[PDB]
Amino acid sequence: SMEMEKEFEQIDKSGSWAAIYQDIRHEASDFPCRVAKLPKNKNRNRYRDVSPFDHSRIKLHQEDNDYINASLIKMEEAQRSYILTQGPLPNTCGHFWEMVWEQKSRGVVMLNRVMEKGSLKCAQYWPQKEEKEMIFEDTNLKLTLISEDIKSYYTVRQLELENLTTQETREILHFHYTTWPDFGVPESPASFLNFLFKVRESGSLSPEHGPVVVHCSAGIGRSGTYCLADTCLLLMDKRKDPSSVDIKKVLLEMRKFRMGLIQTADQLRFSYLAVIEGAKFIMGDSSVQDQWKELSHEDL
Ligand SMILES: O=C(O)C(=O)Nc1sc2c(c1C(=O)O)CCNC2
Ligand SMILES: [Cl-]
Ligand SMILES: [Cl-]
Ligand SMILES: [Cl-]
């Protein structure tokens, strides 16, 4: 059994998930967020306590106001980057797709629903009907729903994003997880890993593309959980060595680039479970992938 499994058992036995998680919060980086806190950006932030650090914020390529609440998580050893961002607001959907355009992203991973716990956690930023495309006048972009593949707990959409200035167009894949509760965890490691591997298999993480965009409502809790699991699996894979992966150190590295990644101790505990289970595929048992698809009951 792997060292992360032994660590997992000892933390479970001693009941120390809350203390381990608080240790991470105490040790996490603290960098300034001066642009995010400028008065003119107040209505560009969904949550007053969630801001991108200045050193890693994504800048929009426009001259009026380049601010978006979004961070580039640049994982050097893993050689994968992610853009983590908040669920766009009704006035920032144009900025969101501007950022997708300028950063050359091929995929968007959405881990939340538009309404959760009775509240609007994210704007309806993509078109729900092929024949009702959206136009973002402020950033001069057009967004059309091309097709969607609805499964029982996630939906994959094919979108066309057009730069109306140049009339160039790109296909964006939208991976929408619809049964992951806010401040909660997926239903099982299997359904989570099935979804995560759906993203991987799409090619959206290819280094020929810009960084994948990942968001939940705040871009930190569910987004941090997804990214930690994905990065740890990729590191294990590069080295073919589960024991070289220190999950808490990877999370602390990610938190150099955006605050608050992973919002509960149970989400941390879930990340361990997902990485431990996914290690079976990494280390050469491809049949677990079929097993996850079955256990996830994705068919409708
Ligand atoms: O969507 C997520 O997974 C996430 O981290 N959400 C977060 S983090 C966070 C909040 C929320 C929210 O959704 O209310 C409220 C304000 N404090 C921090
Ligand atoms: Cl200002
Ligand atoms: Cl909203
Ligand atoms: Cl935190």
From Swiss-Prot:
Phenotype when changing residue 216 to S: Catalytically inactive mutant; abolishes sulfhydration
Entry keyword set: Acetylation, Endoplasmic reticulum, Hydrolase, Membrane, Oxidation, Phosphoprotein, Protein phosphatase, S-nitrosylation
GO CC entries: cytoplasm; cytoplasmic side of endoplasmic reticulum membrane; cytosol; early endosome; endoplasmic reticulum; endosome lumen; glutamatergic synapse; mitochondrial crista
Membrane topology annotation: Peripheral membrane protein
Reactions it catalyzes: O-phospho-L-tyrosyl-[protein] + H2O = L-tyrosyl-[protein] + phosphate
Enzyme nomenclature, EC number: 3.1.3.48
Cysteine sulfinic acid (-SO2H) PTM positions: 216
Binding residue positions for substrate: 182, 216-222, 263
PTM sites of type N-acetylmethionine: 2
Positions of modified residues (S-nitrosocysteine): 216
GO molecular function, one term: cadherin binding
Modified residues (Cysteine persulfide): 216
Tissue specificity field: Expressed in keratinocytes (at protein level).
N,N-(cysteine-1,S-diyl)serine (Cys-Ser) crosslink site(s): 216-217
Residue numbers carrying Cysteine sulfenic acid (-SOH): 216
Family: Belongs to the protein-tyrosine phosphatase family. Non-receptor class 1 subfamily.
Protein name as catalogued: Tyrosine-protein phosphatase non-receptor type 1
Originating organism: Homo sapiens
Organism lineage string: Eukaryota, Metazoa, Chordata, Craniata, Vertebrata
Gene: PTPN1
First-to-last residue of the parent protein present: 1 to 299 of 435
